[PDB]
């Protein structure tokens, strides 16, 4: 027994395994359904342009991030890890989140162009905003903050800038991307005295 919303969630999760081979397409969705033992006809629950699969992927990545940040916070509470200052915390959080893209990196510029279509932009912006909100919550944010916008605008700019750099990066294990991110974070957290 399971609801329709749950059923569609499970199919789209399974479809992700096939995006590397087939792109953000109905074909990936149909392979996902079949990999679960359902009919390929279950792809007909979804559109053809890939928007639902991509938005599903972004949401899932944001959920995985919060679970990672929760786990890391628990290590801190048990005395197994140091509490990181904000610059290192943010660098690690953005890296954790962007690494989730590595298996899909050849397809990620295409996904970004689809997330920017007019009918997707409100949802893509909500998801970005929720992501940076979450990151700041675990970085130690207070419920009430006069710097609410500045913090989120800055962190969104670091994230998106680094994402663009990563789509050009051929260095081993994206070395050059994480060095860029480190510099962007260090400069944003100490903007008054940057080079
Ligand atoms: C603020 C503008 C103009 C674009 C950002 C919206 C966008 C392209 C989001 C892509 C997906 C993303 C970065 C998700 C993070 O949760
Ligand atoms: C690759 C495509 C089609 C779009 C790039 C995604 C965006 C919106 C990048 C701009 C984000 C940025 C560099 C800073 C925050 O606005
Ligand atoms: C774009 C901003 C600042 C917030 C997301 C818009 C919104 C309230 C969506 C409801 O799901």
What secondary-structure arrangement, pairings included, does this model have?
Elements: H1 4-16, H2 19-22, H3 26-35, H4 51-77, H5 86-99, H6 108-115, H7 121-139, H8 148-168, H9 175-189
Helix pairs in contact: 1-3, 1-4, 4-7, 5-9, 7-8, 8-9
Structure description:
The protein is mainly α and 195 residues long. It has a single domain, classed as Tetracycline Repressor, domain 2 (Orthogonal Bundle), CATH 1.10.357.10. 67% of the residues lie in helices and 0% in strands. It contains nine helices and no strands. Helix 1 packs across helix 4 (51-77), helix 7 packs across helix 8 and helix 8 (148-168) packs antiparallel against helix 9 (175-189). The termini are far apart. It binds (2E,6E)-3,7,11-trimethyldodeca-2,6,10-trien-1-ol, (2Z,6E)-3,7,11-trimethyldodeca-2,6,10-trien-1-ol and Geraniol. Geraniol is lined by residues 125-126, 129. (2E,6E)-3,7,11-trimethyldodeca-2,6,10-trien-1-ol binds at residues 58, 62, 112, 115-116, 124-125, 127-128, 131, 160. It is found in: Mitochondrion. The modification N6-acetyllysine is found at residue 83. Keywords: Acetylation, Lipid-binding, Mitochondrion, Primary mitochondrial disease, Transit peptide, Ubiquinone biosynthesis, Ubl conjugation. A 1,2-diacylglycero-3-phosphoethanolamine binds at residue 152. Its main location: mitochondrion.
CATH architecture, by name, is Orthogonal Bundle
Would you list the SSEs in sequence order as H and E? Answer: HHHHHHHHH
What is the subunit arrangement here?
monomer
Task: Name the hetero compounds present.
Answer: (2E,6E)-3,7,11-trimethyldodeca-2,6,10-trien-1-ol, (2Z,6E)-3,7,11-trimethyldodeca-2,6,10-trien-1-ol, Geraniol
Task: Report the CATH superfamily.
Answer: Tetracycline Repressor, domain 2
Query: What is the distance, rounded to the nearest whole angstrom, between the alpha carbons of the first and last residues?
Result: 60 Å
CATH fold-level name:
Tetracycline Repressor, domain 2
Number of domain modules: 1
The CATH top-level class label: Mainly Alpha
**Strand residues, percent:** under 5%
> How many beta-strand elements?
0
CA gyration radius, whole angstroms: 18 Å
Helix/strand class: mainly alpha
Subcellular location: Mitochondrion
GO molecular function, one term: lipid binding
Family: Belongs to the COQ9 family.
Pathway: Cofactor biosynthesis; ubiquinone biosynthesis
């Amino acid at each position: 027994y399971e609801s329709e919303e749950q059923l569609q969630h499970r199919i789209l999760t399974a479809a992700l395994e096939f995006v590397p081979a087939h792109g953000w397409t109905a074909e990936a969705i149909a392979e996902g359904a079949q990999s679960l033992g359902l009919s390929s006809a279950a792809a007909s629950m979804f559109g053809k342009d890939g928007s639902e699969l991509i938005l599903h992927f972004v949401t899932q990545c944001n959920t995985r991030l919060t679970r990672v940040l929760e786990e890391e916070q628990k290590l801190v509470q048990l005395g197994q890890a140091e509490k990181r200052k904000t610059d290192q915390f943010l660098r690690d959080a953005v890296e954790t989140r962007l690494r989730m893209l590595i298996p899909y990196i050849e397809h990620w510029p295409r996904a970004l162009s689809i997330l920017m279509l007019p009918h997707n932009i409100p949802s893509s912006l909500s998801l970005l905003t929720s992501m940076v909100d979450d990151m700041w919550h675990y970085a130690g944010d207070q419920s009430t903050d006069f710097n609410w916008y500045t913090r989120r605008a800055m962190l969104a700019a670091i994230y998106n800038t680094t994402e663009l750099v990563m789509m050009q990066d051929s260095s081993p294990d994206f070395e050059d991307t994480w060095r860029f991110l480190e510099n962007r974070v260090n400069d944003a957290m100490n903007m008054g005295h940057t080079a």
